[PDB]
Structures are given as C-alpha cells and as structure tokens.
Amino acid sequence: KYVDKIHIGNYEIDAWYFSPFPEDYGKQPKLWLCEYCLKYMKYEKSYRFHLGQCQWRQPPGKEIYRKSNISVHEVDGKDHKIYCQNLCLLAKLFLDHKTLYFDVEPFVFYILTEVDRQGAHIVGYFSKEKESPDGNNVSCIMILPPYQRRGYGRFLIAFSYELSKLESTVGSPEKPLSDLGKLSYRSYWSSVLLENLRDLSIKDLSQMTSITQNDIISTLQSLNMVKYWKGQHVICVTPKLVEEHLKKKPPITVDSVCLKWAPP
Ligand SMILES: *N(NC(=O)c1cc(-c2ccccc2)cc(C)c1F)S(=O)(=O)c1ccccc1
C-alpha cells in the first residue's frame, strides 16, 4: 500500500500523491511526523513518546528571516541530510513532479514557520539548487494544505525573489509548476508588475523585481499590456488599464530589514 494520511503537529492531512517512504513506513496507512525534526513514525505510541523526548522546537540551520512570529530557516542539505530528506518525503505527498528526495546535498532548503509559545510550526518550504545552471531561483515549493491559499505561498514566492535581488540576478521557478504553484506565481507576478507600473520598460521591471523578462512578458500578455514591434515585445499601458486590473487580502510581506543574508 501507499501512505495515504499523515499526522503532523495538530493536523491530520490526506496525501495527494505517492511518496517513497520505506515500504514498512509506506505500507502503513498513516504516518506520524514530528513537526520540529520531521522524524516519521509508524505508530501513535511511538509518536507520543517522541513528542516528550524531542528537544527541537524549530527547524535546524540559520534563521535568516524573523519578523514578529514569522520565521524562515535556511537549511543546507549537505549539513542536515536526514532532516532534508524527511522534508522532501513530506513534500512529495503533495507534489506530483518532485523526483528528488534522498540526494539532497546539492540543495538549500528554506523552511517557513509560524511561531507561538510552544515552538516554530512548519508551514511550507522551497528548495533551491546551490548552483543552478538554468537560473532557477526555486526548485520545488510547497505549502501544507491547512495553510494553502492564506498568504503563506505568496510570502515564499516574494522571499525567493528577495534572495535573487540580493544575489543581483533574475530567477524563475523550475518547471513544471504544480497546479496550485502556477496560479500563485501568475497572481504574484501580476500584482508586483501592476503595482510598479501604477507607481518603465520590461528590462526595467526585471531589474527592479528579479522576475525574468520571459515571465514579465507572459504575465503582461495575459493582462493584454504588451504590443509586438519588429520582433520585440514592448510594454503598452494606461491608468484605466493598470488600475482596473488591481481593483484585497493584505499580504504577510517580506520586510528586507528582517532578512539576515548575503550571497554564497
Ligand atoms: N496561495 N498559494 C499557495 O498556498 C501556494 C501553494 C503551493 C502548493 C502547495 C501544495 C502543493 C503544490 C503547491 C505553491 C505555491 C507557490 C503557493 F503560493 S497564496 O499563498 O494565498 C497566494 C500566492 C500568490 C499570490 C496570492 C496568494
């Protein structure tokens, strides 16, 4: 059988996809995951015992972002291999296209948590190649179901671009995108580009945002805001055009004052 349900934190979550946990774990109907160290367990009793023993109350690695109770940890897959493998196995339950789970050393992982008196509770993550020949600033990106469509995914997208800006580079998420990921990027790109235009060339926008010119152009095309002239895309916008594609949920926001981070 496959794993079809997990318990993590105070949540029970149904699986969306196969994930290659060991077949004894895989063969269990339901796995129990420590929300802090991501150990996966077969039984309610081993889970309860672990909860009393585990000393971790947050992800490992460097806390590279903290604003109020919103935290991002940067975890090197070479330095916390087991944790990152466990994270990839969790993620694969909700990602069709992810293929990499155990060979985590080439990646850095950015773990989003929401903190309270008990600890830092995992919401989602994105992985990123330490070296990306293709200029991908996100490899895989996943928000756990109870947190989806609540602003956390937008925060991670914005975060991934704040890192690209700090690296003085453009970047794009690796394809294929999940169905929820594609909707979210398009919405993020639209909002960011429109907010800027309302407040410019395609190249200007790319330098300001670290969004690739390709993603800028495809977004503007869906907004019907580019013309084509002798082989070149060119922005074509007016206020009624801009301001009527913006006219609601206040985002979490990435406050670059609260980001502790320099390029590798
Ligand atoms: N809505 N978006 C998300 O929650 C979200 C979800 C996922 C994802 C989860 C599980 C499996 C596959 C994908 C991926 C991304 C990138 C994502 F954003 S939202 O956070 O409220 C939002 C995002 C962007 C613009 C507006 C709202």
Ligand SMILES: [Cl-]
């Ligand atoms: Cl569920």
Ligand code: NA
């Ligand atoms: Na018993």
Ligand SMILES: [Zn+2]
């Ligand atoms: Zn634990």
